[PDB]
């Protein structure tokens, strides 16, 4: 039989759209008029008639029952995040807020005065007066790794991501402190921050794996640690849990899921300290990146991540661009779509699976050429839908000329045009080139009618509902990832 440790096990995709007032927790549907639209072209399209547009908050994704760390690493780098076991992203074209995937590391990090102050006070809180610093440290990372292990009052401990009452009670206090009373029940805390879709080896590990990880301050250059998957890092002050960091270990680095701290410890600045400690952790274990999740330029609860610097995923081009290079042109909630200035004006969405962009050469934001009210994407996708109907895909054309909800619901229907999803024109190419038949003998279905797995053998002969579900999965994660998928229908 089959090796489930190389499988991505997922539900069928969902496209969930609703009024941003109240579904969006970043803007609650309240946008200044200069930030309401994804591009100048769309603001012009509604110039002076902005009321009729009712901002939507929109996500697309799937639940997973199993994903290994390498596959989760690929999803992160496709623009997804996990919320518990649900893998999701926003519809960057229609969403109220423009969410960008961001990663950084110690090479990008500019140690500002604000950040150095947070470390000096952290050191002063945990360090004995007998501690003797070196006259110089190469890096702030080497300074941290000298004094932190020597504190007799402060201990950070990595451990499996398991519920405890103590962790939950701290969570309740913090969520109340930040006024995030999302019912915060025990079950919800467990699902959000303890239960994960990773393998049992990745969740539970071994005693030696945790021991090696917890010795991270002592790693020397070129040394590596075996840990992948989820972890809790517990911060103790004289035995008292004062903070909890929920972290995913990936081959390419560390992803920060959530961070909580005891509100009575406001003057330890634990929010800044923990991100710096994690940036140091990434460096010490010799991995390239620290992932803070989603960056929203106009939302204070998320734009703090810019202080750690780094680069932003261009989902359309599947490449990162340094935030410093584009910060100026996304500070009004714009969708950015890169295009080298030398390249001709494109008459289509950018091709994913096929002259890749180079952000060191000059480039411009081509969002209105492709996805604007007069862009090519919509017509290109309408023609593509008709071509795909001939293969049995149950897509329908999006004939409303505007992408926004105007003021005078099938959760399995994805819009024809979503940035970062495989363009329907490219899906047509997969069918026409025969590439779709590589799904045969590779993609697997879990059939809940029969409570049984089966390997797809002749994909094009499957029922239209099944071919449609699989094709939407391909839109989301690409053909090669879908080939190792088990999809629950
Ligand atoms: Zn919003």
Taking only Cα atoms into account, the Rg of the chain, rounded to an integer number of angstroms, comes to 24
In 3D, which of 311, 254, 326, 324 has the Cα closest to residue 104?
A: 311
* Helix (H), strand (E), coil (C) string for 20-86: HHHHCCCCCCCCCHHHCCCCHHHHHHCCCCHHHECCEEEEEEEEEEECCHHHHHHHHCCCCEEECCE
Distance 20 CA to ligand 1 centre (A): 6
Classify strands 485-488 and 444-447 as parallel, antiparallel or unpaired: parallel
Helix (H, G, I), strand (E, B) or coil at 220: coil
Map residue 122 onto helix, strand or coil: helix
Spacing, Cα 334 to ligand 1 middle (Å)? 13
DSSP 130-150: T----S--SSHHHHHHHHGGG
432-463 per-residue burial string, b: 16 or more CB within 10 A, e: under 16: eeeebeebeeebbbbeeeeeeeeebeebeebe
Helix axes 270-284, 113-126, angle to 10 degrees: 90
Give the H or E element holding residue 382.
helix 377-389
Say whether the peptide bond before residue 112 is cis (omega within 30 degrees of 0): no
Structure determination technique employed: X-ray
What are the structural domains of the chain? 4-67+80-98+335-488 (no CATH), 113-287 (3.40.630)
Alpha-carbon span 39 to 41, nearest angstrom: 5
Q: Cα separation of 321 and 18, whole Å?
A: 30
> Could you count the other beta carbons within 10 Å of the beta carbon of residue 344?
6
Q: Give me the resolution in angstroms, 1 decimal.
A: 2.2
> How far does residue 315's CA lie from ligand 1's centre (Å)?
19
Provide φ and ψ at 127, rounded to 5°.
-100, 140
* C-alpha 95: how far from chain center: 15
Q: Which of 412, 417, 411 is nearest to 397 (CA)?
A: 417
Question: Would you tell me how many other CB atoms lie within 10 Å of the CB of residue 141?
Answer: 20
Q: How many angstroms separate the alpha carbon of residue 480 from the centre of ligand 1?
A: 33
Cβ atoms of residues 58 and 19 within 8 Å = no
Does the annotation list 194 as a binding residue?
no
CA–centroid distance, residue 446 to ligand 1 (Å): 35
Annotated ligand binding at 24? The verdict is yes
Question: Which three-class secondary structure state does DSSP give residue 160?
Answer: coil
Residue 33 CA, ligand 1 centroid: distance in Å: 13
Interhelix angle for 464-482 vs 424-433, to 10°? 90
- 254 DSSP 8-state letter: E
Residue count of the chain: 489
Q: Do 306 and 314 touch, CB atoms closer than 8 A?
A: no
Q: Which residues contact 348 (CB under 8 A, 6 or more apart)?
A: 370, 376, 377, 380, 423, 425
CA dist., res. 157 & res. 320, Å (int) = 33
Task: Determine the Cα–Cα distance for residues 33 and 23; give it in Å rounded to an integer.
Answer: 19
Residues with CB under 5 A from ligand 1 (ion): 20, 24, 26-27, 96-97
């Amino acid at each position: 039989a089959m090796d489930f440790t190389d499988k991505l096990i997922i539900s069928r995709p969902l496209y969930i759209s609703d009024n941003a007032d109240p579904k969006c927790g970043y803007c609650n549907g309240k946008k200044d008029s200069s930030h309401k639209f994804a591009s100048p072209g769309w603001s012009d399209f509604y110039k002076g008639d902005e009321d009729k547009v009712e901002l939507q908050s929109s996500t697309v994704g799937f639940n997973s029952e199993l994903v290994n760390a390498e596959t989760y690493d690929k999803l992160c780098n496709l623009g997804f995040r996990r919320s518990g076991s649900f893998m999701y992203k926003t519809d960057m074209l229609r969403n109220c807020c423009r969410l960008y995937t961001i990663r950084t590391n110690e090479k990008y990090l500019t140690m500002s005065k604000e950040l150095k102050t947070s470390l000096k006070r952290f050191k002063k809180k945990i360090t004995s007066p007998e501690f003797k610093p070196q006259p110089k440290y190469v890096s702030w990372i080497d300074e941290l790794c000298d004094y932190e292990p020597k504190s007799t009052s402060f201990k950070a401990v990595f451990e499996p991501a398991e519920f405890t009452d103590e962790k939950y009670d701290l969570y309740v206090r913090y969520q109340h402190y930040i006024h995030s009373d999302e019912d915060n029940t025990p079950s919800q805390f467990e699902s959000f921050l303890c239960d994960t879709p990773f393998t049992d080896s990745e969740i539970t590990g071994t005693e030696k794996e945790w021991e090696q990880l917890n010795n991270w301050h002592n790693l020397q250059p070129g040394e590596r640690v075996t840990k992948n998957g989820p972890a809790h890092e517990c911060y103790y002050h004289n035995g008292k849990l004062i903070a909890l960091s929920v972290l995913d270990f990936l081959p390419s680095g560390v992803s920060s899921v959530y961070f909580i701290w005891d509100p009575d410890y406001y003057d330890w600045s634990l929010g800044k300290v923990s991100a710096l400690r994690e940036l140091a952790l990434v460096s010490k274990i010799g991995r390239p990146y620290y992932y803070l999740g989603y960056y929203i330029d106009d939302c204070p609860k998320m734009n703090y991540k810019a202080k750690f610097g780094g680069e932003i995923l261009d989902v359309c081009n599947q490449k990162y661009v340094p935030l410093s290079k584009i910060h100026q042109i996304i500070k009004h909630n714009e969708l950015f779509v890169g295009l080298n200035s030398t390249v001709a004006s494109p008459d289509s969405e950018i091709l994913i699976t096929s002259d890749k962009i180079n952000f060191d050469e000059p480039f411009i934001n081509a969002v209105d050429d492709i996805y604007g009210p007069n862009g090519n994407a919509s017509q290109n996708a309408i023609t593509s839908v008709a071509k795909l109907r001939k293969y049995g895909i149950n897509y329908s054309p999006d004939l409303q000329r505007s992408i926004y909800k105007e003021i005078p619901k099938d959760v399995y229907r994805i819009p024809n045009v979503v940035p970062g999803l495989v363009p329907l024109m490219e899906i047509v190419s997969l069918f026409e080139s025969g590439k779709m038949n590589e799904l045969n003998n590779n993609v697997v279905l879990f059939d809940t009618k029969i409570n049984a797995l089966r390997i797809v053998r002749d994909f094009i002969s499957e029922k239209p509902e099944i071919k449609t579900v699989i094709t939407d999965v391909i839109r989301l994660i690409g053909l090669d990832n879908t080939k190792k998928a088990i999809i629950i229908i």
